[PDB]
Amino acid sequence: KIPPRWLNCPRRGQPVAGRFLPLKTMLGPRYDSQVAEENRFHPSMLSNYLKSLKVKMSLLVDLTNTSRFYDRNDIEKEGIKYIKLQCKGHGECPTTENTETFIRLCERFPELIGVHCTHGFNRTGFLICAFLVEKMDWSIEAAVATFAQARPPGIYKGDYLKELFRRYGDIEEAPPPPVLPDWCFEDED
């Protein structure tokens, strides 16, 4: 079954720090019977969009911990490096080891780096913000606020925002999660 709350979720955010492109997961043709034409997001749609702008993606980081959504060969056949980066499960935010893995990988790679989880907000924003602070010397306040504007409403799990502030700023200054837009729950019933 297609993931819940995916049909209404924007396919991509604006690029962050001129380097990262936040995305929801693509869904290959295997799901076309569950997804109307106007809502599809096959891997070909992403590479065709980049080609239309004469932009290359150097690497696509998949944070979903699954191979059921789409075929990684649809990305690699276009010359984009593909990495499946396993993140801590059980709803927990990425560990320090996961953030180090992410940083080690992205620092080797102008071209964009695509980053996606299932929906493109929490694991995706967490790792992008961690990279911006540890490698690009941004403040965590700036990283979180920029991700929220680029991919609204940004990270929305309160524990993720608190853990970023614990690692990189003052935990007492962590913002509460944003109020969510009405599209988030259109499919609940």
Ligand X SMILES: C[As](C)(=O)[O-]
Residues in contact with ligand X by CB under 6 A are 5, 119, 121, 156, 180, 184
Of 156 and 168, nearer to ligand X (C-beta) is: 156
Residue nearest ligand X, Cβ-based: 184
Q: Where does residue 34 rank: exposed (0-12), middle (13-18), buried (19+ CB within 10 A)?
A: exposed
Of 35 and 184, nearer to ligand X (C-beta) is: 184
Closest CA to 154 of 178, 182, 127, 118: 178
Taking the complex as a whole, the smallest distance from the CB of residue 1 to ligand X amounts, in Å, to 18
CA distance 147 to 50: 21
* Partners of 115 in the β-ladder: 22, 61
CA atoms within 13 A on the CB side of 142: 10
Taking the complex as a whole, the smallest distance from the CB of residue 156 to ligand X amounts, in Å, to 6
Task: Judge whether 166 and 135 are in contact, CB under 8 Å.
Answer: no
Using the Cα atoms of residue 180, residue 183, residue 187 and residue 189 in order, give the sign of their dihedral: positive
Taking the complex as a whole, the smallest distance from the CB of residue 19 to ligand X amounts, in Å, to 22
Of 121 and 168, nearer to ligand X (C-beta) is: 121
Catalytic residue ranges: 117
Taking the complex as a whole, the smallest distance from the CB of residue 18 to ligand X amounts, in Å, to 24
Alpha carbon 89 to chain centroid distance? 16
Which two structure tokens, joined as six digits, stand for 51? 């080609």
Of 5 and 81, nearer to ligand X (C-beta) is: 5
